[PDB]
Write a protein that binds this ligand. Sequence first.
Ligand SMILES: Nc1ncnc2c1ncn2[C@@H]1O[C@H](COP(=O)(O)O)[C@@H](O)[C@H]1O
Ligand SMILES: O=C(O)/C=C/C(=O)O
Ligand SMILES: [Ca+2]
Ligand SMILES: [Ca+2]
Length: 631
Amino acid sequence: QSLAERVARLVAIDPQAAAAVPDKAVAERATQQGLRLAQRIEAFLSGYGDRPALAQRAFEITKDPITGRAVATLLPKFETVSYRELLERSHAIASELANHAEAPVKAGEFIATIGFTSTDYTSLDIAGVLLGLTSVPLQTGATTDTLKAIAEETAPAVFGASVEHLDNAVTTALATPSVRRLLVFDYRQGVDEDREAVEAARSRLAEAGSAVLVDTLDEVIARGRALPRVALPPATDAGDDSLSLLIYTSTPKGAMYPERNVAQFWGGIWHNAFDDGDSAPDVPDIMVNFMPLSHVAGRIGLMGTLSSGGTTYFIAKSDLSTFFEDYSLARPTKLFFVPRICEMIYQHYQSELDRIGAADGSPQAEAIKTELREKLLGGRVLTAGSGSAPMSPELTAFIESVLQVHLVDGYGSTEAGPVWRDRKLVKPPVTEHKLIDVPELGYFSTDSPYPRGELAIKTQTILPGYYKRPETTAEVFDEDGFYLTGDVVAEVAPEEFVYVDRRKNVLKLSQGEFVALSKLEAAYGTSPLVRQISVYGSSQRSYLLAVVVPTPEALAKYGDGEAVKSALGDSLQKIAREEGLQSYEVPRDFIIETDPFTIENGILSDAGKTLRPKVKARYGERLEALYAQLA
Ligand SMILES: Nc1ncnc2c1ncn2[C@@H]1O[C@H](COP(=O)(O)O)[C@@H](O)[C@H]1O
Ligand SMILES: O=C(O)/C=C/C(=O)O
Ligand SMILES: [Ca+2]
Ligand SMILES: [Ca+2]
């Protein structure tokens, strides 16, 4: 039935969901026009009192019976941190940083951080706002070349890193003279691998003659608890226009986020990106977050639950190896997926089908969908949203058949904020739009059946610029002040839009046909044999190739050579037949990769998107050699 009825039924039978309903009085107080961002956050966190705010998987420390090594092992439960405790921890960090005897920090300085998403990272983010720092969250998969370049541009006074990334942090700090302090977070007292990582970091710094101080965030909080709270708001140079955050995207360019635009994450217009946050019903917001804080989508969900009195459960591991465990324990009411997560779930379903030898829409097949919905994903899902990348209709249909709720598609960017939701512009923040012909790619407003062109918009959430890069900023605005999305869209009904592709992903083959490479990647990603695919073309050639990571099942059946190429070929031609793709849209030959694209190896971005230039760097020589061999 309707969302209103399903919400009412859930809160009538589920005490945890009932208690997570927003309190309108808290939001009204926190969002008043007179309050600065730091005061807004404080009003939300203090307003929700002792409610659970954040949850992380519990762990135990065991001694290995052979070596005596003290090892952490996850336990089958989450432990929560209340709104009160989160605010107290963030104030403790702010107090310690501001009053440090040798390397205090002051408003307007920069802090750069490398981590995933966690209670500690959230506390450090908030503390940065309380102090008036500018935060620079760095990609965990970036090379040290990239880290050093961003650190040179931003000259941070403080560097923060999770234990996992501490070696890269040390390398960056050593080459960045502005760094005075290195804070280590997600540090687990008593765990040998964490203690050894911090000792090694201290030793490397000492060997280099560095004056950088190393402290765990555990220690920073313990010292800060006994210190007076810093006064809010911080004494920055520009009020609501002070620089609060830089979101590096793409040297990568840093999108500037003033306080007023960070405030939109905290009960502002971002609650309309993937849902109807404006009008009833008010859905209790219990959510699992698997997105790094370095990506805007990580911020949307996390600050969304914090600003609505709900709860964010953090996935236990960045590589997603605990995904189903965590969703089954957390049992969220609201889902946010991106396509690579939807593909993973589809692959899980296909992998069950094959293990038990059941077919398409059999009773057994439907029982796997039911178990996914009710057990693995928790059975409490009321709403679901997706975004950050295109998804094929077939994958959308699968996900909706599993969840038995509509999957909202939200389109937006770091630069513009949320732009549309289920084809319709999000207004506010969007105030004006137009389509721009792209003749060199064959996209015109006179196209049939639908006008097509690059989307340009005026919007309240537009970035003021890229940090220290006014020439790059000028390139993304036209002469009338519209922001150029770089994205080709079709207007399929009045003020309703569908994504075609990024301009950068559109390729003109040698016989003059145009291909939207990410549309093809989304289509072929649904092959039961494909784990990942990157479609590759050349202006000098008349046909496409692809890098394909087969599923473990495909590799076990066909190997990694000619046999699996032939099976993949059949599967892709099948998809081309069903979805009406042209013959020139079908990859003719393949580079087979048994090593998945990952965030760790840098081929996926923090958001899980396949980075075309990283694929090109790793496989481009082999792809071009295959073109030459075949010619
Ligand atoms: N719902 C969506 N459908 C298709 N592509 C999307 C969607 N949302 C975001 N994108 C893509 O992601 C880009 C923004 O990425 P980011 O700046 O990481 O949010 C856009 O310019 C599009 O290429
Ligand atoms: O869905 C949004 O509004 C943002 C998307 C992105 O930057 O990927
Ligand atoms: Ca700790
Ligand atoms: Ca311009």
